[PDB]
């Protein structure tokens, strides 16, 4: 019993974190095999950030301009190249702690664990979701750039996020490990704002199933709804549309609890139109949308890594 | 910016998790140096769980009755002893992954990270607080016993909790790493109930300071309060009394934000009276009490 916002065990990722310094800027790097990945903005001064020409800034750098520190050992940089918004520093040593890994680009609503780092040292781990507006509501300070997001699928770490910046609203933006930004953001010190966010409907339903599994049923009702009527209500409340794929994905949770997906949608519609009436669900007075259906199944069944 | 429930990176603890089997029972163990720590109830059968006599059950076991598996390697048990409710299995190999560590017994309101495990394998990491009623609101299933709670301030892991059982309300009870239970609980399947839980007042104040540090001030007011008047009000909402120790602990956060502790207490009194009126504080519609003053300073 119990339901917590749970991150993946971070050990496999901790063994990959290094410190990258270029001039006065120090941030985090991810060392996998003989390459260290980090935000390309490590090469910028404050003035360069206003309007950087990264190819021009990079051509002026030599290998010895990048200091990479893994623990208390300095790694030798023997090459450097840029892929989109990520800098790749070739090092003379393959990371002996390199886990089985892959780089995956996730979709909005998908969750992942973030290993927040400063100076190449992991400080904390938290679970979060890629918002529909492509930001993450992370917890990051200056020096956290290069911190990564990941999932574990069996014994393989799938790296999906690298931290680059904080927007004026306090939310965060970054890229996949191929350097492609999530969202309409650019790596430049310039006026940028996140689009209006929406709630991840399939995740709220997953969390309502988790609440039922944990003995919280007050919100259930005798009603059902069509997918189209539910989507009309979802649009009204700034909830993401629910597709048939979402319903299919909620199939196992629906079969385990005996609450059809459209039956749970009728509970969600009533919750949206009426509120919770002073009550809570899993210790929350708001509808939680940062647990996917897979996260709920994983936590309620004790899957290990 | 941002404020999350943040756990410590679990790597240092993952390298210590092992599987311990005694007969038909399998649970988790914590392998540090040449000793594996685990709940002593691993030696119980179904028939032993209401009134086990652990000294009697343990005297009947030989070293080879305990199977310890670290990854895909079986560790040889060369000794065994019981310390309170923890069993200590001496093994023939020191854990090469043993981090710098210590055992610390925590007080209610203290937070820690839990590395939930099954069959010696880590499943997930989350953040917990030791409730005022000495239980923890964890996420644990059958097989999670022996999973541990810890803090890693600097590079030293301070182990503070070892999971032993789930009470009928769904909350969890366990011991420190010296085997002493937190709370009035016993490792027996006899009827046990947690005392009425209360909100950790000092932690709610810490989190209100975190909200101010992160730019939110809507809940502030022009009022102050005496410590005694605050406690008289707060107790009516099942909040823990705020002591002068707590007021002192909030000193740095008070000095950083410019809001006196009793001034923040008046905000809390008003929030308890009015609720949030459709507003949120750090993305929450309820008052959060699982961040300590130390956690707020570390994260913000
Ligand atoms: C200080 C901090 C805190 C947390 N996480 C990260 C950081 N660091 C930064 O944001 C530094 C930075 C890097 C880039 Cl590529 C762009 C940038 O300005 C953009 C952000 C916006 O809206 N204009 C600023
Ligand atoms: C099933 C489960 C789920 C999560 N975490 C742990 C578990 N396992 C247990 O609770 C097993 C267990 C061990 C002990 Cl030492 C005592 C016990 O019964 C006490 C609890 C109560 O009210 N009487 C029960
Ligand atoms: Cl609501």
Swiss-Prot record, chain A:
Changing residue 90 to R: In strain: Beta/B.1.351. This is 3C-like proteinase nsp5. It catalyses: TSAVLQ-|-SGFRK-NH2 and SGVTFQ-|-GKFKK the two peptides corresponding to the two self-cleavage sites of the SARS 3C-like proteinase are the two most reactive peptide substrates. The enzyme exhibits a strong preference for substrates containing Gln at P1 position and Leu at P2 position. It is found in: Host cytoplasm; Host Golgi apparatus; Host nucleus. Changing residue 49 to A: Does not affect ability to cleave and inactivate human TRMT1. It comes from Severe acute respiratory syndrome coronavirus 2. Inhibited by pyridone-containing alpha-ketoamides compounds 13a and 13b. In turn, alpha-ketoamide 13b (tert-butyl (1-((S)-1-(((S)-4-(benzylamino)-3,4-dioxo-1-((S)-2-oxopyrrolidin-3-yl)butan-2-yl)amino)-3-cyclopropyl-1-oxopropan-2-yl)-2-oxo-1,2-dihydropyridin-3-yl)carbamate) inhibits SARS-CoV-2 replication in human lung cells. Inhibited ex vivo by michael acceptor inhibitor N3. Inhibited ex vivo by compound 11a and 11b. Residues 1-305 form the Peptidase C30 domain. Changing residue 145 to A: Complete loss of 3C-like proteinase nsp5 cleavage. Cleaves the C-terminus of replicase polyprotein at 11 sites. Recognizes substrates containing the core sequence [ILMVF]-Q-|-[SGACN]. Cleaves and inactivates human TRMT1, preventing tRNA guanine(26)-dimethylation of tRNAs. May cleave human NLRP1 in lung epithelial cells, thereby activating the NLRP1 inflammasome pathway. May cleave human GSDMD, triggering alternative GSDME-mediated epithelial cell death upon activation of the NLRP1 inflammasome, which may enhance the release interleukins 1B, 6, 16 and 18. Also able to bind an ADP-ribose-1''-phosphate (ADRP).
């Amino acid at each position: 019993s119990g339901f917590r916002k749970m991150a993946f065990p971070s050990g496999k990722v901790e063994g990959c974190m290094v410190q990258v310094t270029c001039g006065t800027t120090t941030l985090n790097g991810l060392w996998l095999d003989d390459v260290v990945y980090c935000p390309r903005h490590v090469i910028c001064t404050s003035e360069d950030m206003l309007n950087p020409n990264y190819e021009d800034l990079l051509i002026r750098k030599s290998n010895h301009n990048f200091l990479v520190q893994a623990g208390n050992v300095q790694l030798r940089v023997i090459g450097h190249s840029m892929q989109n918004c990520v800098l790749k520093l070739k090092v003379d040593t393959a990371n002996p702690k390199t886990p089985k890994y892959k780089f995956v680009r996730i979709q909005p609503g998908q969750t992942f664990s973030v290993l927040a780092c400063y100076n190449g040292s992991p400080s904390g781990v938290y679970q979060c979701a890629m918002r529909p507006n492509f930001t993450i509501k992370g917890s990051f300070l200056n020096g956290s750039c290069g911190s990564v997001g990941f999932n574990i699928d069996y014994d393989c770490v799938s790296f999906c996020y690298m931290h680059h910046m904080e927007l004026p609203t306090g939310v965060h933006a970054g890229t996949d490990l191929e350097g492609n930004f999530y969202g309409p953001f650019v790596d430049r010190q310039t006026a940028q704002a996140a689009g209006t966010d929406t709630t991840i409907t399939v995740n709220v339903l997953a969390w309502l199933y988790a609440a039922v599994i944990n003995g919280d049923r007050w919100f259930l009702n005798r009603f059902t709804t069509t997918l189209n009527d539910f989507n009309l209500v979802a649009m009204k409340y700034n909830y993401e549309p629910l597709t048939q794929d979402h319903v299919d994905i909620l199939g196992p949770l629906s079969a385990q609890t005996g609450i059809a997906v459209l039956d749970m949608c009728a509970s969600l519609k009533e919750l949206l139109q009426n509120g919770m009436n002073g009550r809570t669900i899993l210790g929350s007075a708001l509808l939680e949308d940062e647990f996917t259906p897979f996260d709920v199944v994983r936590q309620c069944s004790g899957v290990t890594f």
